[PDB]
Design a protein around this ligand. Sequence first.
Ligand SMILES: O=C(O)[C@H]1C[C@@H](O)CN1c1ncnc2[nH]ccc12
Length: 164
Amino acid sequence: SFSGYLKLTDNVYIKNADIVEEAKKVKPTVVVNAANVYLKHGGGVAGALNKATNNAMQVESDDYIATNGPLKVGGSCVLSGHNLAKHCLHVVGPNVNKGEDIQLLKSAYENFNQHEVLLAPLLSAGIFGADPIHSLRVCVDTVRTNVYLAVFDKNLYDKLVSSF
Ligand SMILES: O=C(O)[C@H]1C[C@@H](O)CN1c1ncnc2[nH]ccc12
């Protein structure tokens, strides 16, 4: 039920929207979380998605880490989407503020190819410190499945479209 998106390529679409509000409206099969390896959902997209689940995402995530240990940077796991989606794909992009290899951003986006359609944010952008223009380029050159990107910041959305 996606509406109001701008088409960038055959399979990539973009909209100026809060991914939480978009998930509540659409209830997609998969919402992507901008996760860290510990699944500690404190701020940014992860903090906002978790708060919309009334902390149920963090309780589920703590049980997953207690059983499996941390994810790899560039890796992912599929957990419940709670009241927002059928599933949440938690994907770890590199955090440039922590010195992580930006080359891992392509490996992070490759996780999206296991799902036919996804609602997602730009990986490694925002508080993860990478250039969002670079993140959008890696997304369109890596993802082959249908990805609906939600960009919260209006000024960033306008810059991403104008420079595409
Ligand atoms: O604007 C953006 O593209 C990124 C980076 C930063 O502005 C935060 N953010 C988000 N993008 C989409 N839905 C969001 N919900 C909560 C945060 C958030």
